[PDB]
Design a protein around this ligand. Sequence first.
Ligand SMILES: CCCOC(=O)N1CCN(C(=O)c2ccc3ccc(-c4ccc(C5(N)CC5)cc4)nc3c2)C[C@H]1C
Ligand SMILES: C[S@@+](CC[C@H](N)C(=O)[O-])C[C@H]1O[C@@H](n2cnc3c(N)ncnc32)[C@H](O)[C@@H]1O
Ligand SMILES: [Zn+2]
Ligand SMILES: [Zn+2]
Ligand SMILES: [Zn+2]
Length: 423
Amino acid sequence: PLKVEKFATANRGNGLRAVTPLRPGELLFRSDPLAYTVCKGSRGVVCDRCLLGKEKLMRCSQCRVAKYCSAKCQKKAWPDHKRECKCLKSCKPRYPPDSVRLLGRVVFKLMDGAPSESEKLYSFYDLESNINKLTEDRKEGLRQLVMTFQHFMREEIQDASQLPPAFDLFEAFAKVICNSFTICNAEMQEVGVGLYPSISLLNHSCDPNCSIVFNGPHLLLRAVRDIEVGEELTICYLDMLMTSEERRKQLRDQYCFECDCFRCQTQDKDADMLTGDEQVWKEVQESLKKIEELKAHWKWEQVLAMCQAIISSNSERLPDINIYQLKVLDCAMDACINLGLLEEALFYGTRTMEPYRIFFPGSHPVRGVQVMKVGKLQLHQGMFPQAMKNLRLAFDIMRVTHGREHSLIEDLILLLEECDANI
Ligand SMILES: CCCOC(=O)N1CCN(C(=O)c2ccc3ccc(-c4ccc(C5(N)CC5)cc4)nc3c2)C[C@H]1C
Ligand SMILES: C[S@@+](CC[C@H](N)C(=O)[O-])C[C@H]1O[C@@H](n2cnc3c(N)ncnc32)[C@H](O)[C@@H]1O
Ligand SMILES: [Zn+2]
Ligand SMILES: [Zn+2]
Ligand SMILES: [Zn+2]
């Protein structure tokens, strides 16, 4: 019995709205992908199937493109890789765009799969394509993707009857553009892209009453606010660490609407997150493009080197609430942890905390995970009372954002127990 339902909104397409009133932390919907794949950066770094990291993955000897956690995980993936394998074989060496791999998976799934649980509320067919709002520049890229797709699937897809009835690839890529989910791991790094057609009913709010979490490819939708009956459910499409001007551009370019929520109307927090000297945080914003790029490929030592040159720059420095400064910190903390530099990690981590509290209000899973990592590092260097309070704050957030159904909450429980026993 669903707590949520599909409904037609006055001015934002087809919405989700609560059938029963809801409490924060309440599980509202859960779903596996209609189709999904690994992102370009994490190819060969994570298992194609469960998206988990390992030092040595196996690989498909047919393709040699997809790689795997294990025999189990390679063989379970086979039924939805097998028509895709033939395509990237003969496309050796030219790996296709993520969106092109994703659409390939959709077409296979829609041709050869039983109807998916992912289309229960809303189907791929029903997805918004925002086509009467696309700019001529966006459309040019769309047909570039169509031809990219065509070349890419040529040995598996030749004609229209190898597709769904009246399937329009140009229309499909348009849907993909404004409905794709960036799948992130437990530690909150992007490890994939996927589609979840029922979850795509949720419209954006720059201050939402719902959130979504990824547990591998599995997505859980929870309420993060009190919700009453008939109220539309919202999620933030976007990184919390953006100014309203940055949200405006991204909402225009990717999702084709203007947002006139209260936070955009008042440039809420904009001034705070651009404190410090303009020239300085623009360099750092420029540099962050490489830094975030290196991170997308898990090149951790190269990440840390760049980050230190900013955080301990001889030249002028930025306040930690500067979002681009704050972002460097996040990248540096994650780098140290995956480099085993735990003291240096905690140091960046603890600095992020008061700014994170400000920019991730209520219960946000990015915060919960950060606070747990901070508690994790304090626990280990033996700082029990501070860690236990942090692991307790982390739990207060993640109970709302992750829940029993999410496995990371089970790990957080282990950490609470151990530190509490230590005390
Ligand atoms: C329906 C189509 C429109 O909806 C969407 O496209 N959505 C739904 C909302 N969704 C997020 O919830 C999202 C999902 C996965 C994440 C993974 C990592 C981090 C993340 C990790 C670290 C940081 C920082 N180091 C800066 C703090 C920031 C974010 N965020 C993530 C946030 C984005 C996208 C899936
Ligand atoms: C993932 S979908 C949300 C479901 C969509 N309304 C539908 O009917 O299929 C993204 C699209 O919904 C619309 N949308 C989403 N959030 C919005 C908002 N806050 N205001 C106006 N339109 C919005 C935009 O057309 C956007 O491209
Ligand atoms: Zn293969
Ligand atoms: Zn796996
Ligand atoms: Zn807004």
